[PDB]
Amino acid sequence: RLDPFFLDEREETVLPSELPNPPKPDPSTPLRERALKVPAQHRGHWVLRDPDIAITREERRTDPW
Amino acid sequence: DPDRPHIKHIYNQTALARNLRYARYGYFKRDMHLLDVDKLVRHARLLPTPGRLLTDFLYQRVPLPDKSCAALIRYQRQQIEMLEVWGRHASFQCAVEMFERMIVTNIPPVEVGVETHGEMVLCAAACGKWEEGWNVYANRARELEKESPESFILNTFFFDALLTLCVAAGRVSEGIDTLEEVIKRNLRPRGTMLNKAMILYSILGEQMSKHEASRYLCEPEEVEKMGLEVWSLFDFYQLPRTTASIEAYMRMCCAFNKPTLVLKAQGFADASDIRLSIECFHW
Amino acid sequence: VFYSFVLVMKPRQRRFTSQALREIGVAVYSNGGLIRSITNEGIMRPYSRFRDADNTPLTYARYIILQLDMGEEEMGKVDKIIREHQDVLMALKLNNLERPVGIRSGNKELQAAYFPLDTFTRLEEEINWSPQTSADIYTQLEMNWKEFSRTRWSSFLRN
Amino acid sequence: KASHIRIANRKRVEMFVAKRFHLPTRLATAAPDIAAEWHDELNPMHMYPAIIGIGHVQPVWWKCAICSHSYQMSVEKRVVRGGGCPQCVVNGKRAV
Amino acid sequence: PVQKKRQEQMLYGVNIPETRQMKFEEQHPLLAGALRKLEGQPKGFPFWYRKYPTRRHAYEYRFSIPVEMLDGYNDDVKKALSKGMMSIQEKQFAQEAMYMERYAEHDFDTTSPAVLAVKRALKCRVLRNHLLTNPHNNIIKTVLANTERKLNHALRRLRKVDFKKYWEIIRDHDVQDILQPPNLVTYRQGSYWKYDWNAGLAISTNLADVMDPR
Amino acid sequence: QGHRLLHGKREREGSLFAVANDVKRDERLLRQQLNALLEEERMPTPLVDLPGVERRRDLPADPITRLFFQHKGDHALYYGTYDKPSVLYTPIYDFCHRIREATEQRKRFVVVPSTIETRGCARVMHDHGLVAGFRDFHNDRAFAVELKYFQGDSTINVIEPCSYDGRTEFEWSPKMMRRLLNTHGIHNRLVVYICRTADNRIIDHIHAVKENIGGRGLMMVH
Amino acid sequence: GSRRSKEIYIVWFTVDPGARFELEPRLHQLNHWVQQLIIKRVKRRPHIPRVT
Amino acid sequence: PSPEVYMKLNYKNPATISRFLTRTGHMYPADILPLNPEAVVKLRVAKAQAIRIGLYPRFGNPFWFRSQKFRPKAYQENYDPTTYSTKRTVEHFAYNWVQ
Amino acid sequence: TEGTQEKLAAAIQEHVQDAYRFSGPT
Amino acid sequence: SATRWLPFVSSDLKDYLNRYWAVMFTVGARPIETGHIRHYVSWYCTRMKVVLLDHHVYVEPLRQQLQEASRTPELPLLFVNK
Amino acid sequence: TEWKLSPRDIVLRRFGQHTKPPGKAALDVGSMRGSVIPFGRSPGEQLV
RNA sequence: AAUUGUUAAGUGCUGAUUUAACCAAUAAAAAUAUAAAUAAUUUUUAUUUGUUUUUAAACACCAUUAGGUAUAUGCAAAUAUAAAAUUAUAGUAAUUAUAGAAAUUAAAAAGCACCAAUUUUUAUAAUAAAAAUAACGUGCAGUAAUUAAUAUAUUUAUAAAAAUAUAUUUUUUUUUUU
Ligand SMILES: [Zn+2]
């Protein structure tokens, strides 16, 4: 098993919209079915990386986030 | 063939038969399994970095012999030659990285032989690294020789590289020991090896002259006995005299304070054919 | 200053950071270089948590300013030593010290009209000013401030 | 232009030569049992098995695992050519 | 600006006007001017100024500082201004001044053909060394292709106006075939030797000092 | 003792080359200021702002024009205020183009580059009444032509060089000069055709027929 | 939008209506920004529209 | 220019970087914030160098409200320019109860 | 020295295609 | 064309009047009174320079000089033909 | 110091040495198809 | 004001914000302007296509939810930027509106089959008279008040078509002005 760095950040940055202690889900919990694996750089918020709010491919064509 | 051409003026500048654009690197990327990397380094245009050349050779998965590794490190060595004195370290790091890539890849078939170690010793001689060339690479080549004989044998090129390293590093006794190892291995040396040995004897004679002006062997009268016999080794095997041989012999005789041998050598240079090489007039 | 570095280092024990700085200074001195200055800035909490070699986000970090005079090939050697260090999370190389920023890309007529000895002879704190630094602090050093500041607390001691 | 990645967040290498050469030929990844015998005291602090490759020709310090003995061996001699502890080989011929 | 940079390289105080205030100093007084005014060790008038009229005369230290200027400073200031601490531009100017010591007519001379030829050759060496480590720089290719033609022009006029210095430059730097015709078809019609007539160099060699013209 | 050969007009005129490494740098302003530094006020006499000749034999033979010149030894060189204008092929082509583009804009002075065949064509145009006057005519680099206007429009209507493409030059025979004097079946003193003789004298088409000569044709103007 | 996209009408409202007059003028300062966003981000645009 | 701004347009001044940036930390347009041409070159390298060592966040502006001069009052929702010419020098001589 | 026979085969195949150009279409 | 583009800035009110025909000095907190003058001036097809005093480098010099030309401290202020 | 220049790499144009050609400076006789008259065919042409 | 940076820099591919980006290399440097080609035969920053297989985790696309495909770095090939020379075309019918398109409209949008400048095939101990095919441009391919256009490259028999990947242009004035 490899590539933990590719889905994660180089350095942990904290946005001003999530202050303090930004809400991060556990990496052991899998995402939803047919969801999108977006990197931790091009994410709008860590709540959008929740497995229930993980955007799918058909939701990507209609909603941006 | 670029080395033995059967036509004069291989290239031209005509309107329709113009062929200089077809001589660049990339038209020989079609056949890299049959390619000769020595002529590729010598005769090609717009060649990349030799690290990128090694990346393209290992990316095509071609079975590189010792000649290919020697040609790639020879390209890196020519890059070391052309650069300035204060910019030699990074190209030597490129050389040691290419050597590591040639060691650890092992698929496509790549083997490091005595010519590749001689090219690395020549790279360290051009950079001026005694502790990196002699202690690491020469010892690794000697370990690979004493570990597996009959397939990894030190030729004259490896010892010529060692003598170049001993001349560029100023180490005198190690070069004489490598020439004695050449002699004891029952193989003839090159003329440049005897030129480097005469240069090392000149360095030793100049150091003895400085030490006696200021106030291994502390007896200088035997050193000429070890010096002029290197001139006797030119008439020993075949070893025809060249210009740098006359230069090193006159430098060695000037280091030993014998002007009659210099006046004899300047007439011996005009005997058969030697261009008289204005530093020879300096000596 | 010829070269300056802002070393961000992991808050390890005192002996490990001392050995790291000692090896950096030994690599500077062995290549024929001079240390102008080295200053420790304590442990601060940065806006971004850097990751070490084992991918652990560090909340705290130690900042060290290192001002050196080294040759450029030897500076490349020391920079390759520093950037591959296990404790150094990040280090920027201040190469705009002899010539100020905005001369090369700015006005073309104001390109050869500067003096490199103006910036080379002063320290890095006199080129890049801190928020506590100002011009009146520099004029206080030449004004014989010892005979003047002895009366500054004559009004607050009774209240 | 060219894209780069940092091996163990320290060693900036180019991305194409990393996937071919630099990443799978490191000491801590390709030879984990050999990298476990790395000497942490006598080696320099800017040299560690997360960035040092297999074919590092310069000799580094190795702390032996069977006996408590430190020695200097090359990394390519230890992995490619095959190397061990000098005290272990002099005790191996002494026993048998 | 490309001439003002070479003027700053060659001459000492061309940046400093009569008013003793630079163009960068008048807009940025805190960065260019001195911050501290110390009453200590005034050096006085330079009585050794005759040895250094140009910055090509003092390339031993950094910023073309002479040896007499560093007298009372410690070994750290003298080591920080040594040859090992010089930049790439300072080392290339030292290489330029090494030949300017050898081939100049007077001290403020920079446009002799023997000086211009070695300047073009050092520039071609710098551009070739940049194209070795970075072959994908397309501007340096055109600049090298222009500088080699200008070097050919400078050496081809140096061959005609001063043959001894040209032959010395050819012998010393191991470039014997640097003046060769590129194409046989153009050489076959005498177009390579028409350069000597078209540039005004056909009657340049003195016949009494080379051969016997009888 | 071997001496270096002076090659080119810059080394033969003795250029200082004060600017580092540049041989094509302009030199007239710095040399004029150094020559003004060379002169001194002698007290028991200085020079005037009138133009000067380096030799006494170079004075003009006209006694009225000789009042406007004086003898300066080495201060007679580097005279002038205007410099060489830029932005074509021939100085005659540029001299025609600048006058043609400045007569449409109704300007008073045109700064044209001063060569040998340019100021002679300007003198011939001033003789025929197409040019009102000149400014800084002794400058060997550029001089100003003061144009002539009469009742709103310009006196110079059409001014065209002989090298219409700027490259190909022409050599006029005296038969060509007699053709230009009698063109289209009339007697032409209206359109002025100017040539340069083998004696380097700039002569119009009337005086060329008068002494039965030809020359290299420069330009026409009417 | 219209049938040939000559004008676009973006329909908006607020949660609290009393804040609408705080969001009314500033949103009308974004019409050129919306037009540049349509020119940059949107390909196959029948006309560059007037924003309302 | 002012003597204190170009000396402090560096990585070690987080407020002087932030006084030329917007609320999200990015750049203003040229018509809104016109600047000296060297000051923008100083700012764009100072922000990147302070971000690189963690002295400045990659997103945001932690000194934004410190830089805005036109501040509304606590009992107001917008800023009005008529409060600039108040010039209240205590003409009615208000004495606080703690005095 | 070993890869000259395949290069000769490629050269003679190229000469054979140049002779195939005599055939024209198809 | 012959010069690289550069934003105009000045610490004096007189350089704004001598440069532009119609200059307006606004604040960002007053969008209604700014946009009404934007409607009136653009109706007569007049070129206009709007200077937002929010995020300017010479706010305190310009707020003093606008108090001398216009006695009321109210923004925006329209300036046509000096 | 040293000059490591080789004229073979200069003449054969290694490292991709590119000389920009001049702009329509051929000046040949075969392409010209017009008779050249002094002052051109129409010397003074006024655009009205 | 731009290009490149691996052994130098910045770097999540600086263009989301933003007419402004650290450092390194690159702005000039023979005679002659009349001189009858005084110069070179080189390169590609842009688009596709190849180069390798646990050897891109991802994102996107064609079979429908899962496979492959590529895509970005390293190299490489082809084409292209840019007028002029050479040959031919003179007139087309369109544009929308939170429906008086009852309006304004020639500032030239173009030259698988049909039409005989031509072309193809063959004779094995015998050596050319038999067959076939013109050259070039359309070609019913539409509508829903359907439908941005142009240029390059690739794939599908709706091929006079349709799809994919980039670039450029089109805004009607309430945003910008060296
Ligand atoms: Zn052991």
Rounded distance between C-alpha atoms, residue F129 and residue E86, angstroms: 68
- H or E element, residue B260: helix B259-269
Asked if strand L comes closer than 7 Å to C104 Cβ, the answer is yes
D93 torsion bin: left (phi>0), alpha (psi -120 to 50), beta (else): alpha
Residues 10-29 on chain F lying near strand L, CB distance under 7 A: 10, 19-25
Q: CB-based contacts of F200: which residues, under 8 Å, 6+ apart?
A: F116
CA atoms within 13 A on the CB side of E77: 12
In this structure, are residues F77 and F59 in contact, taking their beta carbons and an 8 Å threshold?
A: no
Asked if strand L comes closer than 7 Å to E185 Cβ, the answer is no
Q: Between chain A and chain H, how many beta carbons pairs sit less than 8 Å apart?
A: 11
Q: How far is CA H91 from CA B208, H73, H97, in A?
A: 100, 22, 18
| Chain position carrying tokens 């005299």 | B241
* Chain A contact for H58 (CB, 8 A cutoff): yes
- Chain E neighbours, 3+ Cβ pairs < 8 A: B, C, F, H, K
Kindly provide the b/e burial profile for residues D49-76, where b requires at least 16 CB atoms within 10 angstroms of the residue's own CB. bbbbbbbbbebbbbbbeeeeeebebbbb
What is the chain D residue with the closest CA to B131? D58
Q: Between C8, C91, C101, which is nearest H41 by CB?
A: C101
Q: Between A4, A8, A11, which is nearest C49 by CB?
A: A11
Q: How far is CA B149 from CA B142, B144, B156, D77, H53, in A?
A: 10, 8, 16, 18, 55
Which nucleotide is closest, CA of G7 to its C1'? Answer: L97
* 3-state DSSP assignment of residue B198: helix
Backbone angles phi, psi at F131, to 5 degrees: -130, 130
In this structure, are residues A29 and A51 in contact, taking their beta carbons and an 8 Å threshold?
A: yes
Q: Which of C114, C101, C105 is nearest to E4 (CA)?
A: C114
In this structure, are residues F195 and F214 in contact, taking their beta carbons and an 8 Å threshold?
A: yes
List the structure tokens of J46: 């007049």
Is D16 within any annotated ligand binding site?
no
| Chain position carrying tokens 């030659």 | B81
List the structure tokens of F211: 């002494």
Q: Which of A29, A15, A22, A64 is nearest to A47 (CA)?
A: A22
In this structure, are residues D64 and D85 in contact, taking their beta carbons and an 8 Å threshold?
A: yes
Backbone angles phi, psi at B40, to 5 degrees: -70, -40
Where helices occur in B105-222 by DSSP H, the ranges are: 114-127, 130-132, 139-147, 156-169, 173-184, 191-214
Indicate yes or no: CB of H58 within 8 angstroms of CB of A16.
Answer: no
Is the bond into E181 cis (omega within 30 degrees of 0)?
no
Q: Between C19, C53, C81, which is nearest D8 by CB?
A: C53
C35 DSSP β-pair partners: C68
Is D38 within any annotated ligand binding site?
no
Select from B7, B10, B13, B88 the residue whose CB has the most chain E CBs within 10 Å, as the one to mutate to test that interface: B13
L strand bases under 7 Å from protein CB = 1-14, 16-45, 50-61, 65-66, 72-78, 85-86, 95-99, 119-121, 145-148, 170-178
K39: which chain F residues are within 8 Å (Cβ-Cβ)? 160-162, 164, 220
Rounded distance between C-alpha atoms, residue J60 and residue J73, angstroms: 13
Indicate yes or no: CB of I10 within 8 angstroms of CB of B31.
Answer: yes
| Chain position carrying tokens 């001894």 | E164
| Chain position carrying tokens 């000596």 | B283
Residue K33 CA to L116 C1' — how many Å? 39
- What 8-state DSSP symbol labels residue B106? -
Q: How far is the CA of H58 from the centre of ligand 1 (A)?
A: 50
Chain breaks in chain F (C to N over 2.5 A) after: 44, 87
Q: How far is the CA of D77 from the centre of ligand 1 (A)?
A: 16
* DSSP state letters, D14-83: EHHHIIIIITTTBHHHH-HHHHTTB-SSSS-TT--TTT-BTT--SEEEEE-SSSS-EEEEEHHHHHTTT-
* 3-state DSSP assignment of residue B15: coil
* Chain C contact for H47 (CB, 8 A cutoff): no
Burial class (CB in 10 A: 0-12, 13-18, 19+), A19: exposed
Q: How far is the CA of E12 from the centre of ligand 1 (A)?
A: 66
* DSSP state letters, chain I: --THHHHHHHHHHHHHHHHHTTT---
B36: which chain I residues are within 8 Å (Cβ-Cβ)? 3
Is D67 within any annotated ligand binding site?
yes
Q: How far is CA B259 from CA B211, B230, B271, C60, in A?
A: 21, 18, 19, 75
Q: How far is CA E134 from CA A47, B76, E129, F23, J53, in A?
A: 46, 14, 9, 32, 48
In this structure, are residues B82 and E133 in contact, taking their beta carbons and an 8 Å threshold?
A: no
Burial class (CB in 10 A: 0-12, 13-18, 19+), I17: exposed
Q: How far is CA B14 from CA B2, B11, B21, E185, F191, in A?
A: 20, 9, 12, 10, 51
Q: Between chain E and chain K, how many beta carbons pairs sit less than 8 Å apart?
A: 52
List the structure tokens of B275: 């261009």
Q: How far is CA E131 from CA B47, E94, E142, in A?
A: 11, 22, 11
Residue G44 CA to L141 C1' — how many Å? 24
Backbone angles phi, psi at F53, to 5 degrees: -115, 145
Q: Which of C48, C140, B270 is nearest to A9 (CA)?
A: C48
Asked if strand L comes closer than 7 Å to B29 Cβ, the answer is yes
| Chain position carrying tokens 């990074």 | B90
Question: Residue at minimal CA–C1' distance from L36?
Answer: F168
Distance from CA of C47 to the nearest CA of E (A): 30
Select from K12, K15, K20 the residue whose CB has the most chain E CBs within 10 Å, as the one to mutate to test that interface: K15
**Distance between terminal CA atoms of chain C?**
47
Residues 84-123 on chain F lying near strand L, CB distance under 7 A: 89-91, 93, 115, 117
Where helices occur in chain F by DSSP H, the ranges are: 9-12, 28-38, 91-103, 116-127, 174-181, 205-210
Rounded distance between C-alpha atoms, residue F140 and residue F78, angstroms: 8
Which nucleotide is closest, CA of J3 to its C1'? Answer: L178
In this structure, are residues E114 and E159 in contact, taking their beta carbons and an 8 Å threshold?
A: no
Rounded distance between C-alpha atoms, residue A31 and residue K10, angstroms: 62
Rounded distance between C-alpha atoms, residue C95 and residue C120, angstroms: 12
Q: How far is CA B260 from CA A63, B22, B266, in A?
A: 97, 57, 10
E135: which chain B residues are within 8 Å (Cβ-Cβ)? 46-49
- H or E element, residue F135: strand F131-135
Select from E8, E92, E129 the residue whose CB has the most chain C CBs within 10 Å, as the one to mutate to test that interface: E8
Asked if strand L comes closer than 7 Å to E159 Cβ, the answer is no
* DSSP state letters, F190-216: SSEEEEE-TTS-EEEHHHHHHTT--EE
Rounded distance between C-alpha atoms, residue H78 and residue H95, angstroms: 30
* 3-state DSSP assignment of residue B158: helix
* Chain J contact for G32 (CB, 8 A cutoff): no
Q: CB-based contacts of G48: which residues, under 8 Å, 6+ apart?
A: G35, G38, G39
Q: How far is the CA of D39 from the centre of ligand 1 (A)?
A: 13
* Chain K contact for F158 (CB, 8 A cutoff): yes
Residue D80 is which amino acid? V
Q: Which of C73, C117, C79 is nearest to C98 (CA)?
A: C117
List the structure tokens of K25: 């400076």
What's the distance, CA J57 to chain centroid? 14
Q: How many CB atoms lie within 10 A of CB F49?
A: 6
Farthest-apart Cα atoms in chain G, separation: 39
Burial class (CB in 10 A: 0-12, 13-18, 19+), F96: buried
Is D6 within any annotated ligand binding site?
no
Asked if strand L comes closer than 7 Å to C31 Cβ, the answer is no
**Structure-derived torsion over alpha carbons of residues D39, D41, D45, D51, reported in degrees to the nearest 10:** 10
Which nucleotide is closest, CA of B46 to its C1'? Answer: L43
Q: How far is the CA of D85 from the centre of ligand 1 (A)?
A: 4
Q: How far is the CA of D93 from the centre of ligand 1 (A)?
A: 13
Rounded distance between C-alpha atoms, residue B93 and residue B101, angstroms: 12
Q: How many CB atoms lie within 10 A of CB B115?
A: 20
Indicate yes or no: CB of C92 within 8 angstroms of CB of H55.
Answer: no
Residues 48-87 on chain B lying near strand L, CB distance under 7 A: 48-52, 55-56, 59-61, 79
Helices and strands, counts by H and E, chain K: 1, 0
In this structure, are residues C62 and C9 in contact, taking their beta carbons and an 8 Å threshold?
A: yes
Indicate yes or no: CB of D17 within 8 angstroms of CB of B140.
Answer: no
User: Resolution in angstroms for this experimental structure?
Assistant: 3.1
B12: which chain E residues are within 8 Å (Cβ-Cβ)? 183
**Structure-derived torsion over alpha carbons of residues E203, E207, E210, F2, reported in degrees to the nearest 10:** -80
- What 8-state DSSP symbol labels residue E125? H
Indicate yes or no: CB of K15 within 8 angstroms of CB of B46.
Answer: yes
- H or E element, residue B72: helix B66-82
In this structure, are residues D79 and B100 in contact, taking their beta carbons and an 8 Å threshold?
A: no
Rounded distance between C-alpha atoms, residue A58 and residue B101, angstroms: 46
How were these coordinates obtained?
A: cryo-EM
K38: which chain F residues are within 8 Å (Cβ-Cβ)? 162, 164, 170, 172, 217
Q: CB-based contacts of J22: which residues, under 8 Å, 6+ apart?
A: J41, J46, J47, J48, J49, J78, J79, J80
In this structure, are residues H17 and C57 in contact, taking their beta carbons and an 8 Å threshold?
A: no
Q: CB-based contacts of B83: which residues, under 8 Å, 6+ apart?
A: B91, E129, E132
Q: Between K1, K4, K14, which is nearest B45 by CB?
A: K14
